[PDB]
């Protein structure tokens, strides 16, 4: 036995389909470790989760553990170069990231198949000897502030922190987690506090081995991985740090029976109901939280939400167990509010308790629990193959809370039925123990309090005893009934035999004037489920802003008529998605194949026999109206990407255009739109999964025949199947389209360097070049110069036309343009001075990314589907383009750069979108030409050509 290892649990409870082998072990210093050996993985990955979170932050230094996690990436004493950790992963087709939750600081990364040892050596040094360079502390603090400035105006984070402010002020639950520049450098130097030493005071007192968990995934054997982890992580300093618990509740009686009227940024109307409950993570064997969450958050027949639809008060409801920390949890029941549902809040909550007592009346239902036990064991047995990076991060988090032998069955399987624990939680859900919160702009001007961190104006008022006592006498409502037997639970998991004529890529098996079917039976994953994607085409889905609205409202009403029916199938892992596109409708049905056609049939039947409820039309059209105006509050970097898509697309309707034409959407016009939309269709579909070729053709005939016999569908002409083109830019042209952002104080920018049409030469020219500047653009533009948090540089493929794009969200003026051009010159000298060894280190890096095997069924279907929507159908694009990628020379890329992308390039096609804030109008930058300011989109597209479309194979 190795004395650096305390115990080794070799038998980890595994899914019988999981061909990966595991081994859990606990080192002598306390680090819980799980080892995953997948001899076929193309990306090795590891992750570490420290059990110290932002709750342990010093009170005077808000958000220190989060600041710590940013500073660990910037160097250790054995790897002192500031980007060595980031660059080594970039050169070997890997990525890395981390986050700071309340009780965890979780680091993770993926790396190349064969380079696990090199990266894990650099990764382990974070916990042994980090430099905390003061030149890096003075800069990366600005990247943390930009992380806050991007979230300051986000309503989800504003409510997240407003919950913190209402509790006991000196409970650590009220602590600020993110932390801006104020809490990190402006305040501590103002009071004489060495922040860098406080990082060490925190790192050398909390980052102990007994609070760490490591997961490592790679092709190396379990024994080679065991020796690989003990050599790097057994020398982590153990310090016997006590496990931080918070047994005292953050909400005492002073904070109960309280209502909070909040003003949101967006025009949203939500109602949050919170019930404080004890810590339930010790009863995970029974999990009484998901039992009550399953019934309250139920949306089926006689459910709680389905009745709130009948009265036009609510549109969505989520309810159940909400994680808090060790020692306390919450039980939420959050709902959307209609225009009338905001005015009848009390009856909503009364109807909530009218449901809760129906659960108290009929007592616990053991048949519901055992159904959950059945559904989860099946969903776990046929669990999809996870991605290595997210898998290790997730397991490293739950590795603290469960024995090694049950880390895989922890979140999934339930074992004991405990009606005593259900009664315990159900007993603590009374109005005497309630907290209400109303989010609505109808309250603006009537708020008397201001939260300090986000500026969210709200008002606190106590619930009248009249209302509480009325809620205490919650009588049993007739319209509430327990959910009936979920009959969508799949019974047949038979893996259909693989055909001898089966194909490795989707095969066009049917070509009619109506439909074109793409089919491949699953020959890789062998799971009893299938993906059914349909792309219905109709020009009247995007002719004018009126029709595109009705294309959405039709499909949005269509899911409202199916929520009762579909929720049972959703619980059986049989989900469906339906949404309007610019070309028509998009239906995607994924999940178990057993009862799949039954769901697909009712979607198509009600698609052709739909009858609008006048009550639910006006409700959704109201919500759709607020959804179009709530885009002004989106972050500027999303306004940058939005405007560029409207510029470089043949035709596109703005949010404002759809909103102005929504006043013309009357119910009679929408009723006459459906027969006109469903008049002529063309069905391009992909049926990939556990189905035969005869069934796939039979499934397609179900969609054809159902639309013919109920919508009299007529085959569409092929000359009408015109997909939109991309605007072809002029040589040496620089266009700038700028517009203001009404909410945010930062600037957004997207610099598009349009290269040429997609081709195996042009595609791998850019993907290799985008790979080379992938790391340097992130380092020079964010870590070194600290422009902002959002720094992205990659390829942009759209409508068969591609190019190189830079998306930056900063507090600096679109100076951003100068820097991006100045950064390109830094790369041009870098490639000339780039060694041949370091050059193909990038080529083999890109080849790993492209040839990365899709690990789950839904991932392969989307990869095929991408070729189908793009009308290219290059299904072997991976193997084809990598063969050409390896043939490129460094001299080939420089000729590509100097001809297409350089500042003096003869074929530079540069367009910039500048999303300005509300009051803004030593590496030296090159001389930039005076650009032509785009004034009108329609006049702009009128004077330019349109690129062709990629010819299919």
């Amino acid at each position: 036995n190795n004395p650096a290892i305390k115990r080794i649990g070799n038998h980890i409870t595994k899914s019988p389909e999981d061909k990966r082998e595991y081994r859990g072990l606990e080192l002598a210093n306390g680090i819980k470790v799980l080892l995953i050996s997948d001899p076929t993985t193309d990306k090795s990955s590891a992750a570490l989760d420290v059990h110290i979170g932002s709750l342990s932050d010093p009170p005077n230094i808000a958000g220190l553990s989060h600041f710590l996690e940013h500073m660990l990436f910037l160097g250790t004493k054995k790897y002192p170069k500031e980007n060595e950790y980031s660059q080594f992963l970039s050169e070997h087709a890997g990525s890395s990231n981390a986050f700071t939750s309340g009780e965890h600081t979780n680091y993770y990364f993926d790396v190349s198949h064969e380079h696990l040892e090199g990266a894990l050596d650099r990764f382990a040094q974070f916990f042994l000897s980090p430099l905390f360079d003061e030149s890096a502390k003075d800069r990366e603090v600005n990247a943390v502030d930009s992380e806050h400035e991007k979230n300051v105006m986000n309503d989800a984070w504003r409510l997240f922190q407003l919950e913190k402010a209402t509790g006991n002020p000196k409970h650590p639950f009220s602590k600020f987690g993110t932390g801006n520049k104020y809490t990190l450098e402006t305040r501590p130097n103002q009071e004489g506090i060495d922040v860098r030493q406080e990082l060490l005071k925190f790192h050398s007192a909390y980052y102990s081995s007994n609070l760490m968990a490591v997961v490592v995934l790679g092709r190396e054997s379990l024994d080679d991985l065991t020796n690989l982890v003990v050599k790097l992580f057994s020398e982590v300093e153990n310090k016997n740090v006590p496990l931080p618990e918070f047994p005292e509740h953050p909400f005492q009686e002073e904070h109960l029976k309280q209502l909070y009227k909040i003003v949101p940024i967006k025009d949203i109307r939500n109602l949050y109901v919170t019930f404080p409950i004890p810590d339930l993570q010790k009863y995970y064997k029974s999990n009484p939280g998901h039992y009550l969450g399953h019934l309250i958050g139920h949306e089926g027949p006689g459910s709680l939400l389905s009745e709130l639809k009948s009265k036009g008060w609510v549109n969505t409801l989520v309810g159940g167990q909400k994680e808090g920390a060790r020692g306390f949890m919450f039980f939420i029941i959050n709902v959307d509010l209609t225009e009338e549902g905001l005015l009848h809040v009390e009856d909503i909550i009364l109807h909530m308790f009218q449901y809760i007592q129906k659960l108290r009346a009929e007592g616990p239902q053991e048949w519901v629990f055992q159904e959950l036990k059945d559904l989860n064991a099946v969903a776990f047995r046929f669990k999809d193959k996870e991605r290595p990076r997210g898998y290790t991060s997730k397991i490293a988090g739950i590795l603290h809370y469960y024995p090694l032998e049950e880390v895989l069955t922890a979140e999934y399987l339930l074992e004991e039925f405990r009606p005593d624990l259900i009664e315990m939680v159900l007993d603590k859900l009374r109005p005497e123990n309630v907290r209400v919160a109303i989010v609505s702009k109808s309250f603006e001007g009537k708020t008397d309090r201001t939260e300090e961190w986000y500026g969210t104006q709200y008002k606190q008022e106590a619930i009248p005893d009249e209302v509480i006592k009325k809620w205490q006498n919650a009588d049993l409502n007739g319209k509430f009934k327990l959910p009936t037997k979920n009959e969508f639970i799949p019974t047949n998991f038979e893996i259909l035999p693989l055909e001898k004529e089966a194909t490795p890529y989707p095969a066009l098996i049917k070509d009619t004037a109506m439909s074109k079917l793409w089919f491949k039976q699953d020959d890789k994953f062998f799971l009893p489920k299938a993906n059914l994607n349909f792309e219905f085409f109709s020009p009247f889905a995007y002719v004018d802003p009126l029709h595109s609205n009705m294309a959405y409202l039709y499909l949005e009403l269509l899911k409202d008529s199916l929520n009762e029916y579909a929720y049972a199938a959703e619980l059986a892992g049989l989900s469906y998605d339906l949404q309007n596109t610019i070309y028509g409708m998009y239906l995607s049905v994924k999940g178990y194949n057993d009862k799949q056609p039954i769901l697909l049939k009712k979607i198509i039947e009600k698609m052709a026999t739909f009858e609008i409820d006048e009550k639910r039309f006006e409700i959704i059209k109201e919500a759709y109206m607020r959804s179009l105006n709530n885009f002004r509050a989106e972050q500027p970097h999303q306004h940058a990407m939005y405007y560029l898509r409207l510029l470089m697309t043949e035709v596109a309707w703005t949010k404002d255009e759809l909103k102005e034409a929504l006043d013309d959407v009357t119910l009679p016009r929408l009723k006459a739109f459906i027969p006109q939309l469903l008049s002529r269709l063309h069905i391009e579909a992909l049926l990939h999964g556990n189905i035969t070729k005869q069934a796939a053709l039979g499934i397609m005939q179900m969609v054809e025949d159902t639309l013919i016999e109920h919508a009299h569908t007529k085959p569409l002409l092929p000359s009408q199947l015109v997909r939109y083109r991309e605007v072809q830019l002029p040589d040496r042209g620089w266009f700038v389209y700028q517009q203001r952002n009404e909410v945010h104080n930062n600037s957004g920018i997207e610099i598009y360097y349009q290269t040429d049409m997609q081709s195996t030469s042009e595609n791998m020219f850019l993907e290799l070049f985008a790979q080379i500047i992938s790391e340097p653009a992130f380092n020079t533009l964010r870590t070194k110069e600290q422009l902002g948090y959002i720094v992205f540089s990659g390829p942009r493929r759209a409508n068969g036309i591609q190019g190189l794009r830079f998306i930056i969200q900063s507090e600096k003026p679109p100076y951003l343009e100068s820097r991006v051009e100045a950064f390109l010159i830094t790369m041009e000298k870098s490639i000339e001075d780039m060694t041949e060894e370091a050059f193909q280190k990038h080529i083999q890096a890109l080849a790993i990314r492209r040839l990365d095997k899709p690990k789950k069924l839904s991932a392969e279907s989307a990869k095929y589907w991408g070729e189908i929507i793009s009308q290219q159908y290059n299904f072997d694009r991976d193997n084809t383009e990598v063969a050409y990628l390896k043939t490129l020379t460094k001299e080939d890329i420089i000729k590509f750069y100097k001809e297409m992308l350089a500042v003096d390039a003869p074929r530079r096609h540069k367009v910039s979108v500048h999303v300005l804030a509300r009051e803004m109008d030593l590496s030296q930058a090159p001389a930039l030409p005076q650009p032509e300011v785009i004034q009108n989109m329609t006049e702009f597209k009128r004077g330019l050509p349109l690129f062709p479309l990629v010819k299919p194979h």
Partner: antibody
Amino acid sequence: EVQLVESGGGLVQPGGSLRLSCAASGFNISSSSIHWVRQAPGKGLEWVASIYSYSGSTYYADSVKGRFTISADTSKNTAYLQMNSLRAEDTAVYYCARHYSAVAGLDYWGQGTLVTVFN
Amino acid sequence: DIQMTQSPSSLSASVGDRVTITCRASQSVSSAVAWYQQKPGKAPKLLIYSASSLYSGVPSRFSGSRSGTDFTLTISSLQPEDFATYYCQQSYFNPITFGQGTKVEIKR
């Protein structure tokens, strides 16, 4: 000193508009529910509407839903009821009352103003 | 939504007589009913809340009861300050409804 004072009552023509005000004194209105109760001369009691001054603003009766708009201002500690599309049916004495700390209350009533709808 | 009926439309009793007035509901209403006294001209006065609880400052001769959908206000001994119009209420987050009224007329 817990009293309620109605105001704003007088003469209106059909289709006109009135806005009544119930001035609360001796307690904050966000503490309990305010109700409006009218009485036509010769008839019994009739429930007009109610306002929950903290939130969950409006609960109206089927006989006035759509014609009446009830509101309140916590800073003024006062509740209002604007009356639109007035019929000859709505001529009545409009009482305003505080609800008790129970399920069935209305313990404190007021003077009650007169709304006459006529030429 | 839910409506309230009356037991008598009017009655005639003497001083010392016992008065029992009944309202009856349409649907099941668990307590949540109040009795009011309105002397002609001025505002009504609350008598019984929660269909049984005697309001503070109300003479003890008043008592409210509940039997399913029936609510009975019993005055043990009528008196010169006890003759007026008597209404009952309904309290639920539905529209509050009243009774037609009971006009207890004394007789000397």
